[PDB]
Scaffold this active site. Structure first.
Site, PDB file in Angstrom:
ATOM      1  CB  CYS A 145       8.547   7.351   8.762  1.00  0.00           C
ATOM      2  SG  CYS A 145       9.893   7.759   7.610  1.00  0.00           S
TER       3      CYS A 145
ATOM      4  CG  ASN B 102      -1.743  -1.345   1.311  1.00  0.00           C
ATOM      5  OD1 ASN B 102      -1.819  -1.919   2.403  1.00  0.00           O
ATOM      6  ND2 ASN B 102      -2.277  -1.879   0.216  1.00  0.00           N
TER       7      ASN B 102
ATOM      8  CG  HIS C 223       1.136   3.289   4.171  1.00  0.00           C
ATOM      9  ND1 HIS C 223       0.870   4.511   4.749  1.00  0.00           N
ATOM     10  CD2 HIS C 223       0.102   2.944   3.375  1.00  0.00           C
ATOM     11  CE1 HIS C 223      -0.303   4.887   4.269  1.00  0.00           C
ATOM     12  NE2 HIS C 223      -0.804   3.975   3.437  1.00  0.00           N
TER      13      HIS C 223
END
Ligand SMILES: CC(C)(C)c1cn2cccnc2n1
Ligand SMILES: CC(C)(C)c1cn2cccnc2n1
EC number: 3.1.2.14
Lengths: 268, 269
Positions: free
Chosen positions: B227, B190, B192
Site C-alpha cells: 500500500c 525506507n 514504506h
C-alpha cells in the site's frame, strides 16, 4: 528504571528500536513522546500509584477525579539514532491550585549531553462530567510528598516558548490533511485516544518536502477536547515565519476545536 | 539481546510498555508483531548485516534485491501484561529455491513457559521492478552460514494452520472498515508502510463486541501487494465459523486491487 537518591525524580534508559525511527534513521517525535509518557508511568508506579489511573491518589479515585494533559511542549536538539541508548529523567512539581507540571530531560547515555527537554501542564478533572475544578488541599497533601518543593524547571528562561499563548488558525489554511480516524492501536488501556496520536495528526498537514529537508526542533501543543473513537479529525497548517507553522485540529463535521499548536523546524 | 552459543539463533528480553497494551492491560497483537520484527533486525545486525536493508547480502545489494514478507502466521496462548518481561527466540531457515522462513518462540521470563509462537515466509524480489525470483546459489552461500541446517520449526505439526490456503472473501462482506490511510508513524525508515499496519487494518473490520468478549488466538496473513503512502484501504470481514473464525480482505478503496488476505481465530474470555 529507578528513582534518584532523594526519591524526588526518576531515571530510565531506552534502546531506540528499528520501527521507532523515520527516514534519517533517528527516533521520530512520536517515539520520544511515547518514551516520555512511559517513564512518567514508571515513576508513578515506583512511588505507590496502582494501575488503571495515572497518578490518581486515594481521594481522587473516591471522587472520580483524573489528571488530564492541558499542554505539552517539546524541544529536541539531537534525535537519538536506531540502536542508541537515550536516558530520560523526569519529575513532577505542583503549581498551586492551577494544577501540576511534569518535566523531562533527554540525555545521550554515552556522551552524557542533553539532547532534548520537555514540559507538560496537567489539570484535575472529573472523569464522568469532564469538569475541571481546582486542586483540592486534601489531594495536595497526598501527592506533594513525591514532588521537590524548590523549583526545578526544564525550561527556566524568562519568556520561553513553553508558556506562549497559541492563536487560532484562520481559514483558509495553507496546508491540510482531512479525514483522519483513530484505529485500535491509537487507543490506550482505558479506550481513549492517546495524547501522542494528536502529535502525529498535527504533523500530517506539514508538507512532505519540509519533512525531507528540515528537522523538527520545537513543538507546542494545547489539548482542548478529546477525540472519540468514532470521530473524524481535520488537520490544518499555515506557515507563520528556520520555518514556523501554526496548527489546528478540529472535528471533520461541526468543526469543533480539539487541538491547537506551533512547530519550529531547522534546515538540515 | 544476544546470539545463542552456536550463533544460529538470537534471544532478547522486552519489558511490556504502558502504551503497548489494550483494555485487558495485556500487549496487543501489533505490539507482539513489532517485537518480532525488532528481534529479527537485531539478529541480522548481530551477524554482520548493515543498517541499510534487512538481511541483504553483498550480492543482494549489488543486484538491487531485497527480502519481502509473503506470509505471516502468529499463535498466542497468553498475552504478556504491562510490566512483564517477554523473552523471544528467533532464527532463520532456508526453504531451498523458494525462499526463507523466519520463526519465533515467545516465552515468559519468570515461568519459562511458551506463551506464543510465530512463523513468516519471505521471498526474494527486485527493489525497483518489484519482480520475484528464486533464491540464487551465490546468494544462498552468503546467508546459509547463519541458518541451522537441520529443520527447526516453531510449527512442526502434520496439518497446521500456518500453511493452509486462504480463500478470497466474497462480496458482500459481513463487516467493513472503509477509508483507511497510513500516516507517517505507519511508515518505516525506507518510507514504506510497516507490515504491522496491515495487521491492525485487518482487525479494524472486526466488531468491537467480539474484541471485548474474545481474545485473538491465531492470525494468518498473506501479503500480495504493498500500500503506497497516498493509497486508501478498505478492510472487509466475514464470520466463517465457543471459538470464532473470520475471513479477511484488504483492498484499495478505488480500483479494488487486493493487497492482503487472511484469517483469525478468537476464543471466549
Ligand atoms: C509525582 C506523581 C506520581 C505524584 C505525579 C502526579 N502527577 C500528576 C500529573 C502528572 N504527573 C504527575 N506525577
Ligand atoms: C539469518 C539471516 C540474517 C541470514 C536472515 C536472512 N533472512 C531472510 C529473510 C528473513 N529473515 C532472515 N534472516
Amino acid at each position: 528504571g529507578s528513582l534518584t537518591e532523594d526519591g524526588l525524580s526518576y531515571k530510565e534508559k531506552f534502546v531506540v528500536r528499528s520501527y521507532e525511527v523515520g527516514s534519517n534513521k533517528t527516533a521520530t517525535v512520536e517515539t520520544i513522546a511515547n518514551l516520555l509518557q512511559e517513564v512518567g508511568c514508571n515513576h508513578a508506579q515506583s512511588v505507590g500509584f496502582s494501575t488503571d489511573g495515572f497518578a490518581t491518589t486515594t481521594t481522587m479515585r473516591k471522587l472520580h477525579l483524573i489528571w488530564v494533559t492541558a499542554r505539552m511542549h517539546i524541544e529536541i536538539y539531537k534525535y537519538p539514532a536506531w540502536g542508541d541508548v537515550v536516558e530520560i529523567e523526569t519529575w513532577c512539581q505542583s503549581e498551586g491550585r492551577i494544577g501540576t507540571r511534569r518535566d523531562w530531560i533527554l540525555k545521550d547515555s554515552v556522551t552524557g549531553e542533553v539532547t532534548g527537554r520537555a514540559t507538560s501542564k496537567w489539570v484535575m478533572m472529573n472523569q464522568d462530567t469532564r469538569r475541571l475544578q481546582k486542586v483540592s488541599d486534601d489531594v495536595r497533601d497526598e501527592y506533594l510528598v513525591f514532588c521537590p518543593q524548590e523549583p526545578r524547571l526544564a525550561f527556566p528562561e524568562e519568556n520561553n516558548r513553553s508558556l506562549k499563548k497559541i492563536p487560532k488558525l484562520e481559514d483558509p489554511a495553507q496546508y491540510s490533511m482531512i479525514g483522519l480516524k483513530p484505529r485500535r492501536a491509537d487507543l490506550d488501556m482505558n479506550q481513549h485516544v492517546n495524547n501522542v496520536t494528536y502529535i502525529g495528526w498535527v504533523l500530517e498537514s506539514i508538507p512532505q518536502e519540509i519533512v525531507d529537508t528540515h528537522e523538527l526542533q520545537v513543538i507546542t501543543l494545547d489539548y482542548r477536547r478529546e477525540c472519540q473513537q468514532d470521530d473524524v479529525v481535520d488537520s490544518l497548517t499555515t506557515t507563520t515565519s528556520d520555518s514556523q507553522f501554526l496548527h489546528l485540529l478540529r472535528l471533520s463535521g461541526d468543526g469543533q476545536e480539539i487541538n491547537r499548536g506551533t512547530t519550529l523546524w531547522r534546515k538540515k
